[PDB]
């Protein structure tokens, strides 16, 4: 239940002290057989939400998640961060 | 005493030698006892414009590097290479002298050729990916699958070669640009294939036989309709001199004879015909370009020209409107090489290559003479000044006007 | 192929000027024309470059570059020679030692008034062969923006008022512009570029020590003639493996500045980029050595150079166009009979140049900029190997950077 | 939409490289990139549309369904009042009328979308503004 902190920091921290090998062990397999057994009663309707944010942040190790997955492009030309306006 | 004369043409067979006495260091070995012989009895004066041609041949092959303590009286022993062959190399090297042994020795042939190192590879691990770029040792193994002794390690190398040039293609159609053939390896393998095109057809238990197969697979799949935009010229016009024009390797050339036959034969399988008509290395261009070949006058390109033709007539036989619309010109390219080859030496076999063709010209006429009985306006050759509806007569009083030549 | 489709019928229509067979007999089926690559290749010059692209006998394209209206025969004679002496000049220090070989070139002028070379396709001028290596967009603001003001016109100041913007300039305050011109151009960019087409750094350098060797070699070539190659872009080099051939005789007999509207005070080209090609060389070293060897083999040539620009016209009308052959014979003999670079340059300046700005300005830093320059003038018309080509490098090519500059002689280039 | 699927995708690791395809999920991922409250929720929908399709672009080295399953969200989703959509639309249909551009680019597919996109953006009923981002397309 402190995963879904309203204090998105703590349940962060929550989520780093859940997957940690200790908590949740490093291992995706093992990671997932531990997810399998940590389901909470009354989680079920952000079990999966928790559970998909848990496996996908163990990709962070993966030395090509951070990668581009593209390197030839079709049509290349400049590519700089894009803005856009966000009033209230 | 006989060799004294025209030294020169004794060199070839040595070339050979140095070529194939890998197979056979015997081979090398016994042309080196003939170099031996030449250096005893031949004067230096004679023997001295081709020093050049000795050092580097001599530098082929050269580039590589019971029975108990107890006395049992040893009854067992009582009762009883190509290194070898390098160390007289070396022997008779430094019996030859400075000058000679330099001859060995501008352009200094390797300038960086790919100046954008684009082939690399990020290889995959654990903890990260690194990456490595794989054409620096593209050069390389280009010479060590071309040079290599150890048949077992030579083979390797080029199968690792073979690997490799696989994964590239495909890389090379990645990212493809606007600007020769996006130029990814387009000009750095019209460079580099002719090696791998001999090695197609070499003396191999197995190079030979996949990699000619290997090409095969390549140029028949370089002969697509989409497959098509100057990504199979680059390769054919690669073909077009070395395989078919040079001096050496007449496998090769039938090899590569043949293969281009079947090339355009897979074409017009899987090129659209206008593809074709609107191709401008096409057949028509083809023809063109073996007319110039048999014209280029020189024993290489006018042989070169003629096997070719001789080869592709397994098909061009079966080949029907061009052959139609191409007789008078095919007729007079063949007159041309009869009379360029009598007008030089006829132990070139490129004398049975034109009698080849003239059986190939008589055999098209016999299907269809009565398609040329009549006066037919198909295209004109320079050899047929008269511009007429052409006729099989037209190029018969050509012919007999045309007689009495001086070859 | 226009009027008289490709044949033989008529003649086996060949490349002029490659006949060039010394007694031996030249081939008939010698490399000639069949086919034709030509395709509207017009460069936009004086003479209207033609490229015209000859696709020979093997068809394999040739493409030619076709000159336009002057005494394009003096070019002819000028690379006949340039073959002549450098292919028996220096090759090698052993091969010095025989005084043989250097790269050279030709050149087949029809007329007075038209001019037919080779177009080669496989080289680069030096200021394109750079401006393709660096950020492009450097090439064009730092070229464009502070090259003429910052350097250029602190050096003078103005156009028109450049030549008496030099009658104020010194030599320090254009050994002050030139280390500006320094700050107008990139360095360095060189080594990136060789060594971007460097596989092997040593083949390398043998392959650029001898390109710098022999642009060294010709840059006294163009002492000797008063060639007019002001600008870098001027001068070629193949971006193959740096061949090297001349570009724009315009001016001969110590012409390179006579008769010039711009000034032009360089005995030789002395682009800061051809030192920074790799940056411990001293200059001093192997070309030094190289060139010691050219003079040593400089002795018998009068017997043949004045003998042969002189033996037809003594080449006529270029420099009414750019005066008496009879003048311009003595001013070349004065210039081969061992002569000071300084007092030549000094002598060619005031003669022409005496009316225009800064002339004694222009003949004093001809003898030298500052002491260890103007001392130039003491060995005059005549001086050692080593004596003569360190005044030259030292006394004549570095002050020409300091003590005036045209914008179009590319200085910082 | 066809009994073959295409967008496979091995997720990176140190030793598996799980592979999932993606076709299943594009209808109701369209849907939420043009219908979610959210402005996060749409906005990353929108996001992750932009990024599949360029990854799709990178899978075209014949697929016209998907492409007829794309253009009409492309539709909508463009002429959105809202800022944040068309914001990221303008780069969007400009970077895809350039990709479109492309004579490699000028079979069955971009032809094909045109049509389709700017004819409907005007017979629409409604949205007239999209006839109008039409006429720009």
Same mark, same amino acid.
């Given at each position: 239940?402190?995963?879904?902190?309203?204090?998105?920091?703590?349940?962060?921290?929550?989520?780093?002290?859940?997957?940690?090998?200790?908590?949740?062990?490093?291992?995706?397999?093992?990671?997932?057989?531990?997810?399998?057994?940590?389901?909470?009663?009354?989680?079920?309707?952000?079990?999966?939400?928790?559970?998909?944010?848990?496996?996908?942040?163990?990709?962070?190790?993966?030395?090509?998640?951070?990668?581009?997955?593209?390197?030839?492009?079709?049509?290349?030309?400049?590519?700089?961060?894009?803005?856009?306006?966000?009033?209230? | 005493?006989?060799?004294?004369?025209?030294?020169?043409?004794?060199?070839?067979?040595?070339?050979?030698?140095?070529?194939?006495?890998?197979?056979?260091?015997?081979?090398?070995?016994?042309?080196?006892?003939?170099?031996?012989?030449?250096?005893?009895?031949?004067?230096?004066?004679?023997?001295?414009?081709?020093?050049?041609?000795?050092?580097?041949?001599?530098?082929?092959?050269?580039?590589?590097?019971?029975?108990?303590?107890?006395?049992?009286?040893?009854?067992? =022993? #009582?009762?009883?290479?190509? %290194?070898?062959?390098?160390?007289? !190399?070396?022997? $008779? /090297? +430094?019996?030859?002298?400075?000058?000679?042994?330099?001859?060995?020795?501008?352009?200094?042939?390797?300038?960086?050729?790919?100046?954008?190192?684009?082939?690399?590879?990020?290889?995959?691990?654990?903890?990260?990916?690194?990456?490595?770029?794989?054409?620096?040792?593209?050069?390389?193994?280009?010479?060590?699958?071309?040079?290599?002794?150890?048949?077992? =390690? #030579?083979?390797?190398?080029? %199968?690792?070669?073979?690997?490799? !040039?696989?994964? $590239? /293609? +495909?890389?090379?159609?990645?990212?493809?640009?606007?600007?020769?053939?996006?130029?990814?390896?387009?000009?750095?393998?019209?460079?580099?294939?002719?090696?791998?095109?001999?090695?197609?057809?070499?003396?191999?238990?197995?190079?030979?036989?996949?990699?000619?197969?290997?090409?095969?697979?390549?140029?028949?799949?370089?002969?697509?309709?989409?497959?098509?935009?100057?990504?199979?010229?680059?390769?054919?016009?690669?073909?077009?001199?070395?395989?078919?024009?040079?001096?050496?390797?007449?496998?090769?050339?039938?090899?590569?004879?043949?293969?281009?036959?079947?090339?355009?034969?897979?074409?017009?399988?899987?090129?659209?015909?206008?593809?074709?008509?609107?191709?401008?290395?096409?057949?028509?261009?083809?023809?063109?370009?073996?007319?110039?070949?048999?014209?280029?006058?020189?024993?290489?390109?006018?042989?070169?020209?003629?096997?070719?033709?001789?080869?592709?007539?397994?098909?061009?036989?079966?080949?029907?409107?061009?052959?139609?619309?191409?007789?008078?010109?095919?007729?007079?390219?063949?007159?041309?090489?009869?009379?360029?080859?009598?007008?030089?030496?006829?132990?070139?076999?490129?004398?049975?290559?034109?009698?080849?063709?003239?059986?190939?010209?008589?055999?098209?006429?016999?299907?269809?003479?009565?398609?040329?009985?009549?006066?037919?306006?198909?295209?004109?050759?320079?050899?047929?000044?008269?511009?007429?509806?052409?006729?099989?007569?037209?190029?018969?009083?050509?012919?007999?006007?045309?007689?009495?030549?001086?070859? | 192929?226009?009027?008289?489709?490709?044949?033989?019928?008529?003649?086996?229509?060949?490349?002029?000027?490659?006949?060039?067979?010394?007694?031996?007999?030249?081939?008939?089926?010698?490399?000639?024309?069949?086919?034709?690559?030509?395709?509207?290749?017009?460069?936009?010059?004086?003479?209207?470059?033609?490229?015209?692209?000859?696709?020979?006998?093997?068809?394999?394209?040739?493409?030619?570059?076709?000159?336009?209206?002057?005494?394009?025969?003096?070019?002819?004679?000028?690379?006949?020679?340039?073959?002549?002496?450098?292919?028996?000049?220096?090759?090698?220090?052993?091969?010095?030692?025989?005084?043989?070989?250097?790269?050279?070139?030709?050149?087949?002028?029809?007329?007075?008034?038209?001019?037919?070379?080779?177009?080669?396709?496989?080289?680069?001028?030096?200021?394109?062969?750079?401006?393709?290596?660096?950020?492009?967009?450097?090439?064009?603001?730092?070229?464009?923006?502070?090259?003429?003001?910052?350097?250029?016109?602190?050096?003078?100041?103005?156009?028109?008022?450049?030549?008496?913007?030099?009658?104020?300039?010194?030599?320090?305050?254009?050994?002050?512009?030139?280390?500006?011109?320094?700050?107008?151009?990139?360095?360095?960019?060189?080594?990136?570029?060789?060594?971007?087409?460097?596989?092997?750094?040593?083949?390398?350098?043998?392959?650029?020590?001898?390109?710098?060797?022999?642009?060294?070699?010709?840059?006294?070539?163009?002492?000797?003639?008063?060639?007019?190659?002001?600008?870098?872009?001027?001068?070629?080099?193949?971006?193959?493996?740096?061949?090297?051939?001349?570009?724009?005789?315009?001016?001969?007999?110590?012409?390179?500045?006579?008769?010039?509207?711009?000034?032009?005070?360089?005995?030789?080209?002395?682009?800061?980029?051809?030192?920074?090609?790799?940056?411990?060389?001293?200059?001093?070293?192997?070309?030094?050595?190289?060139?010691?060897?050219?003079?040593?083999?400089?002795?018998?040539?009068?017997?043949?150079?004045?003998?042969?620009?002189?033996?037809?016209?003594?080449?006529?009308?270029?420099?009414?166009?750019?005066?008496?052959?009879?003048?311009?014979?003595?001013?070349?003999?004065?210039?081969?009979?061992?002569?000071?670079?300084?007092?030549?340059?000094?002598?060619?300046?005031?003669?022409?140049?005496?009316?225009?700005?800064?002339?004694?300005?222009?003949?004093?830093?001809?003898?030298?900029?500052?002491?260890?320059?103007?001392?130039?003038?003491?060995?005059?018309?005549?001086?050692?190997?080593?004596?003569?080509?360190?005044?030259?490098?030292?006394?004549?090519?570095?002050?020409?950077?300091?003590?005036?500059?045209?914008?179009?002689?590319?200085?910082?280039?």
């Amino acid at each position: 239940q402190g995963l879904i902190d309203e204090n998105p920091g703590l349940q962060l921290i929550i989520r780093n002290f859940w997957s940690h090998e200790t908590r949740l062990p490093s291992n995706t397999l093992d990671r997932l057989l531990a997810l399998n057994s940590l389901y909470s009663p009354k989680i079920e309707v952000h079990f999966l939400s928790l559970a998909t944010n848990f496996l996908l942040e163990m990709t962070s190790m993966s030395p090509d998640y951070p990668n581009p997955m593209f390197e030839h492009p079709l049509s290349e030309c400049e590519f700089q961060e894009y803005t856009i306006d966000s009033d209230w | 005493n006989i060799i004294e004369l025209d030294v020169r043409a004794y060199v070839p067979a040595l070339q050979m030698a140095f070529k194939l006495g890998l197979s056979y260091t015997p081979l090398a070995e016994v042309g080196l006892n003939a170099l031996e012989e030449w250096s005893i009895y031949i004067d230096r004066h004679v023997m001295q414009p081709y020093y050049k041609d000795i050092l580097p041949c001599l530098d082929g092959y050269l580039k590589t590097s019971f029975n108990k303590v107890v006395l049992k009286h040893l009854k067992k =022993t #009582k009762n009883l290479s190509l %290194e070898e062959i390098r160390i007289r !190399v070396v022997q $008779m /090297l +430094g019996s030859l002298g400075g000058q000679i042994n330099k001859n060995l020795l501008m352009m200094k042939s390797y300038v960086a050729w790919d100046r954008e190192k684009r082939l690399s590879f990020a290889v995959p691990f654990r903890e990260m990916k690194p990456v490595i770029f794989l054409d620096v040792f593209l050069p390389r193994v280009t010479e060590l699958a071309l040079t290599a002794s150890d048949r077992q =390690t #030579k083979v390797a190398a080029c %199968e690792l070669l073979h690997s490799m !040039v696989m994964f $590239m /293609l +495909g890389k090379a159609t990645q990212m493809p640009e606007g600007g020769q053939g996006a130029p990814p390896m387009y000009q750095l393998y019209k460079r580099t294939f002719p090696v791998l095109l001999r090695l197609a057809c070499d003396v191999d238990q197995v190079t030979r036989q996949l990699y000619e197969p290997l090409v095969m697979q390549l140029i028949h799949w370089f002969t697509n309709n989409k497959k098509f935009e100057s990504q199979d010229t680059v390769a054919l016009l690669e073909a077009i001199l070395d395989g078919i024009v040079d001096p050496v390797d007449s496998t090769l050339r039938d090899f590569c004879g043949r293969c281009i036959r079947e090339f355009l034969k897979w074409s017009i399988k899987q090129i659209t015909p206008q593809q074709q008509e609107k191709s401008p290395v096409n057949t028509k261009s083809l023809f063109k370009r073996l007319y110039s070949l048999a014209l280029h006058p020189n024993a290489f390109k006018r042989l070169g020209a003629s096997l070719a033709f001789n080869n592709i007539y397994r098909e061009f036989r079966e080949e029907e409107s061009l052959v139609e619309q191409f007789v008078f010109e095919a007729l007079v390219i063949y007159m041309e090489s009869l009379a360029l080859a009598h007008a030089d030496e006829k132990s070139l076999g490129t004398i049975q290559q034109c009698c080849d063709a003239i059986d190939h010209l008589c055999r098209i006429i016999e299907k269809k003479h009565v398609s040329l009985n009549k006066a037919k306006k198909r295209r004109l050759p320079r050899g047929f000044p008269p511009s007429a509806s052409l006729c099989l007569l037209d190029l018969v009083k050509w012919l007999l006007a045309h007689c009495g030549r001086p070859q | 192929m226009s009027d008289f489709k490709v044949e033989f019928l008529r003649n086996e229509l060949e490349i002029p000027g490659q006949y060039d067979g010394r007694g031996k007999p030249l081939p008939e089926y010698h490399v000639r024309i069949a086919g034709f690559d030509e395709r509207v290749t017009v460069m936009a010059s004086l003479r209207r470059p033609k490229r015209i692209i000859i696709r020979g006998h093997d068809e394999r394209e040739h493409p030619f570059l076709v000159k336009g209206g002057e005494d394009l025969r003096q070019d002819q004679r000028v690379e006949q020679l340039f073959q002549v002496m450098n292919g028996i000049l220096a090759q090698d220090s052993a091969c010095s030692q025989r005084a043989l070989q250097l790269r050279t070139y030709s050149v087949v002028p029809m007329t007075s008034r038209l001019g037919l070379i080779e177009w080669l396709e496989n080289t680069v001028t030096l200021k394109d062969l750079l401006l393709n290596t660096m950020s492009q967009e450097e090439k064009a603001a730092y070229l464009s923006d502070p090259r003429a003001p910052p350097c250029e016109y602190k050096d003078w100041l103005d156009v028109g008022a450049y030549m008496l913007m030099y009658k104020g300039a010194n030599r320090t305050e254009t050994v002050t512009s030139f280390r500006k011109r320094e700050s107008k151009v990139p360095a360095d960019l060189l080594k990136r570029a060789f060594v971007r087409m460097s596989t092997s750094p040593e083949a390398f350098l043998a392959l650029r020590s001898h390109f710098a060797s022999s642009h060294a070699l010709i840059c006294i070539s163009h002492w000797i003639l008063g060639i007019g190659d002001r600008h870098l872009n001027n001068f070629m080099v193949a971006m193959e493996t740096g061949g090297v051939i001349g570009i724009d005789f315009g001016h001969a007999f110590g012409s390179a500045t006579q008769f010039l509207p711009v000034p032009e005070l360089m005995p030789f080209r002395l682009t800061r980029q051809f030192i920074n090609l790799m940056l411990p060389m001293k200059e001093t070293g192997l070309m030094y050595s190289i060139m010691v060897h050219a003079l040593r083999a400089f002795r018998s040539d009068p017997g043949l150079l004045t003998n042969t620009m002189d033996v037809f016209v003594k080449e006529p009308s270029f420099d009414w166009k750019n005066w008496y052959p009879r003048q311009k014979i003595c001013y070349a003999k004065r210039k081969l009979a061992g002569a000071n670079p300084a007092v030549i340059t000094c002598d060619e300046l005031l003669l022409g140049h005496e009316k225009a700005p800064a002339f004694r300005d222009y003949v004093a830093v001809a003898r030298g900029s500052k002491d260890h320059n103007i001392r130039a003038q003491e060995p005059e018309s005549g001086l050692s190997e080593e004596t003569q080509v360190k005044c030259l490098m030292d006394q004549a090519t570095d002050p020409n950077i300091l003590g005036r500059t045209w914008e179009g002689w590319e200085p910082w280039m």
